Input
Amino acid sequence: PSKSAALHIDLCKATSPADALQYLLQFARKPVEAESVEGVVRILLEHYYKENDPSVRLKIASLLGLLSKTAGFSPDCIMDDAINILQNEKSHQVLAQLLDTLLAIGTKLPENQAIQMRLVDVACKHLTDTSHGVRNKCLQLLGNLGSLEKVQKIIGDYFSDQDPRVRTAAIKAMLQLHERGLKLHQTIYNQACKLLSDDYEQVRSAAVQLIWVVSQLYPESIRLVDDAFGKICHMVSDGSWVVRVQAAKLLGSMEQVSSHFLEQTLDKTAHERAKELYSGAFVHGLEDEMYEVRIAAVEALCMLAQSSPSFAEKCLDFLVDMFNDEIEEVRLQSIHTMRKISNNITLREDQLDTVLAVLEDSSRDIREALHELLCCTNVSTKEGIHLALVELLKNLTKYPTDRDSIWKCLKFLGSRHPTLVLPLVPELLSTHPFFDTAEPDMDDPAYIAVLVLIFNAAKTCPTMPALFSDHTFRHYAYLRDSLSHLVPALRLPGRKDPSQQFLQQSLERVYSLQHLDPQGAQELLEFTIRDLQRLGELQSELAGVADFSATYLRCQLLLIKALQEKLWNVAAPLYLKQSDLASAAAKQIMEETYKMEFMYSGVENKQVVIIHHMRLQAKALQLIVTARTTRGLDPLFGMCEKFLQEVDFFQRYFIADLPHLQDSFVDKLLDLMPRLMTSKPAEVVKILQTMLRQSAFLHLPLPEQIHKASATIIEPAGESDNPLRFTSGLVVALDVDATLEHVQDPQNTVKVQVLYPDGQAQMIHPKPADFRNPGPGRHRLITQVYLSHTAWTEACQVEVRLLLAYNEGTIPFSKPVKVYIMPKPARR
Amino acid sequence: MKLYCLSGHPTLPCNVLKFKSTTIMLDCGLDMTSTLNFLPLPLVQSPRLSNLPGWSLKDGNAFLDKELKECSGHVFVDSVPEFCLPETELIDLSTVDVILISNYHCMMALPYITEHTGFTGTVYATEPTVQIGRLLMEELVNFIERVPKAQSASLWKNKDIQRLLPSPLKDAVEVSTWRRCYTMQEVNSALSKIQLVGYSQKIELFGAVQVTPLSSGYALGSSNWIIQSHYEKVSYVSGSSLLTTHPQPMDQASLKNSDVLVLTGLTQIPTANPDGMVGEFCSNLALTVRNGGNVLVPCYPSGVIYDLLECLYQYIDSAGLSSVPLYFISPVANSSLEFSQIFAEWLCHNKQSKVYLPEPPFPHAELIQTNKLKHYPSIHGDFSNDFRQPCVVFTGHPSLRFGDVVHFMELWGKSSLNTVIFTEPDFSYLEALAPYQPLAMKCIYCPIDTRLNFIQVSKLLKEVQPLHVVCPEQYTQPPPAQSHRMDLMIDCQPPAMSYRRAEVLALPFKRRYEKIEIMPELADSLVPMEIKPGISLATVSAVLHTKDNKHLLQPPKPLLSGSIPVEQFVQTLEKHGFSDIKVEDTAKGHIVLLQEAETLIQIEEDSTHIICDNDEMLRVRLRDLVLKFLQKF
Output
């Protein structure tokens, strides 16, 4: 159809470059065929291919490949492409287009044997070109159509052929063959060495990846992995930094090696000069170039140091001197690798400079990482414990904000090794051997920091409750009272589903006691509503389902009050004024159904069709009220037509669950539907009135532990009487910082609404980078809101609130905040 | 050699040149013509733009009332603004190998090609080009961001509705491939894929080609390219400025003696006198300041801004307007000033000597020191604390369809005393200023251009004399503004073939020779010999060794040429030892008989024939004799 029309248009136009390029571009950019007509389009393209303009032919071949990407065609297109490749030897462009079409056909769908890939591979092998025509493309063809787990001769020749581009394509094919397996051999190792020596860029970069992969395949040459590793290091000392980054990451991926060869790599020093005072691979690869190769080197070192239980000291010094690397990424990665290798590790002298490291200007990340290092480290000496304590107290008294991390790292230190601190107990806390020492301060953070270390030490060793004083006894009582997760339980002499069932029972009570007086229904509904509200406050994990069923019961009570309104007792033509609690009920009940559908997180289609039933009931009540108030027979006819149309939409959407609805308003109305088509709207609304008066009450199946969304703006605070000041017409940027809890699709649903006090609403959408996701189902919105207006006489209050939009309407689910805004006029 | 032109824009090209075994593409256009068509993005939602009425389809079937809006009898599309792309499907950009950049305006469209398509080769640009390009893409992504307007319409992008719509929406070209804007991870990916180059640097590609950049002089670091093999020369000139400007002056010495010259990046307003319009700018600025209002100037943060601030420095010293302040507002302002400050060696000799005599080359650092000009990243905050009236504001974006420019003229539209001054020629100011119309603001259109006019084009082509010239169809054709004028079209002998958007040309050249090297021992072994005056030749016998497309010959079947004389033949047979040899003559040849082995030889014009018995040693003796009585080819 469309393809035949396009072919006819192309044949009718027959302009040389112009109509051909225009038709090809239109056919490609319009749409996919999305049908079986792709074969007919390919047949028409193959018929039209017997012409001039090989550029247009290549574009047609690319279009054929793009059409084959939808996986409609297979063997017939394969045979046609084979014929075209056999009979279309016309220069590099058409050869490349044929190669690309062959790759698309091979990788598109079949991935099978029996002339699905083997025939194409043989065709590529026979049609290897003479000068850069297909060579790279046919190499990647054989890579992606590797034959079987039984090409090695021809890839060996194509390693030593002319073009470095062809060499790199062969190497990429080697990547593909290894990731498909194929079990390469040791002649590949030898030719990979001679490809490491290739005098040219990036050929080296991928060939050294090949030498890594054959070395990790098998270590059998004479020592194969040691020779490969030495080649890797002598390649690390190359000038090219991309090559070096590749080199360091791959040698880190290498995991087993001769240990003595590893110390030969680390061999050259002021480290051993300082060690006596107390008593060339990596040594160029760390301080050779900047932070790319530095990070790659430290990740290599962490991986192989986690591999080797030995060897760690000779990189321990090489990290402790290479903290201050003037790039904070390198700093953080150095601390992280020291953590990850800090096992069976002593720091008998390095504690001094590694704690001069934690003394630091602001560097909040660095100081936190060093606290983690000190909590996960090991030490050997009592003096080291003492000085670690004294400069940790320096840090706490200098930056009194990360005291929480200080206390937790002291806790981990005491838990890690308790017995070191035992001689310090008389010294660290002043306990004068006969005097009554004055009582220490209780909430002094330094004293807390020492006390938590003491108790974490006293977890195991029992020989210091006698060392404790009486203030220490009551302070252990207070600290165990206050910080439950920082101090453990000790042995001091002084200190030696009902909810779900009840919810189900109350709901089934209402469901059973449905068949009684409207008044008694009202009091039962009110009682159970405030009951479930109390339960939702009472517990947390039942709060969502409790509030959901509670607002459903509020919905039902609202509709029953609207029905029991005295408007029905009073005669029809009056409808005075202001008694339309029914109409206000209709608006509230529609809003509550929307809220009940969208603001909650876990809803399933049974609940959803119950919601839509209730929404139909709401529309019916609204139609009844407007029928009561409206005199125009044609507005009545229009409203009746729209209401019945929506009923038809409901049943068409929910064909299902009609057996689940028993004695239902909607299903009984569907039974009486054709008579509503026949009858005048007056008796329609009369029957609808009585019908819904004695319709039903549906059961609402309670689902699993669902939650309702909750938005809380923590910034701005909004208690500030200091106004935010600017000049007229100019804008002030106000950050909005809010916590969202249990929201699906947050970047598309949560929108900011600002009310300007002249009464207008501005709706600001946040960009989807403003929704950080620190955990599961709990998000943080950090955004800018741009406020501007003309000048005001005094400061006023601008409202900021978080609206939730669906798909159609918006629902507030956040507490509003007031921000004081005052624009000045121009200064001159 | 083959050329694919993927951009019908004369100033913002993409040229895929296929030469030898490599593919080199030049430049990257990101046409903001569709940006002009889309609605502006207010930083704060203005009431009038909020309640702009919705233009409706006359049939009424489509929802163009909310897809589109109308203003002042003119229609616009309501969405996030789009950007026109060069047509990428004409050639696989993955098979396209190496990318060159002229300038930052020609690198604006780089993350599109370098991330999505699958290109994996190398990209070249100079340091000021790549840095000012990073600043520009940062500003652009910020302004498309900083307020997300995620609405997008497509039924107007349907072709039938586009046909039904009036101009310029009728005049929209290639609406289907227009795309949304790119992001920081894309920016950083392209800007890590970049590699560096200085002027006159010879970069070899695979031994196949060698490329060199030359100072075009239009922008700081703007560079024309030269691609050469050892017999072939392509000079790609895009956006040069041979007038006295702040960058390095244009260098035509290597530009000349070129086989194929491609010329793009010419002027947009040929009739504009630059320094004259700069003076008119200064006069109008002084008039507005003396009237006591506010002036807006939208400008890119390179080039024209520096020239404008220098002239305004001299003019404020002339007119004594030190009371009124200058505010340069853009999120890239501080880094732009610092980069223009330290980029010294790329300047001209005056500014280099200014560096050599310890002062900064630009006077706006001294302007900052004197506090007349203050830079601000965004209008929210301390700028709102320090704003003044009367005032001068140079704002971030010149296409007027987004940013602090659109917010400021929404603020100032009601007043008439204030003044807007356009300074960049890359868009039509009528379609730029259409959405805010009616507008009390005084508009004065004095565009500033440094690209070379057609007179200088004619002078440069007559100076360099290339074999082939390639220029756009818009430069071949008369402009619609002045079709009567003749000097507005490029003239060249031979006339240059043109091209349209997404077009293919095969350039008039055939590859004949290439570069091979001999090795000195083989050259010692070879002995030339002479058959003609001034011509000495020698047969060769060697082994080729070709690594990385460079070719050399080393020692490890030639035939005959030339007639043999019968008289010398028999004379040397007699003096060598052969005897009793008899010669008879024919109409054109000689029959010579040697009685030993019964040898009869006929000699004719380009015809010789020897017939003897079954003999071997006499046959090989006659073989070497007749082969040594001629010249070997």
